[PDB]
């Protein structure tokens, strides 16, 4: 599945709440299984902070 068609059916954007990230998945690299954040390509410009998600943590594009 190429770009514009990568649809992570079961992995929701924490920032806008789309339940499976379509286009490309932006995975939260440092966040743990409990707080297993993900963003959509509309949303990965975000750099929020929680108890565990941080400005020091990393985002990763997924093209499959």
């Amino acid at each position: 599945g190429p770009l514009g068609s990568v649809q992570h059916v079961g992995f929701k954007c924490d920032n806008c709440g789309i339940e499976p990230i379509q286009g490309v998945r932006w995975h939260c690299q440092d966040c743990p299984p409990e707080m297993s954040l993900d963003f959509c390509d509309s949303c990965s410009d975000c750099l929020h902070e929680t108890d565990i998600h941080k400005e020091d943590h990393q985002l990763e594009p997924i093209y499959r």
């Binding site: 059916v9 079961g10 992995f11 929701k12 954007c13 924490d14 339940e19 499976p20 299984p33 297993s36 954040l37 993900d38």
Partner: peptide
């Protein structure tokens, strides 16, 4: 955020 459960294949 994960929304799909892991492939546990037990206690459905």
């Amino acid at each position: 955020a994960r929304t799909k459960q892991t492939a546990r294949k037990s206690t459905g």
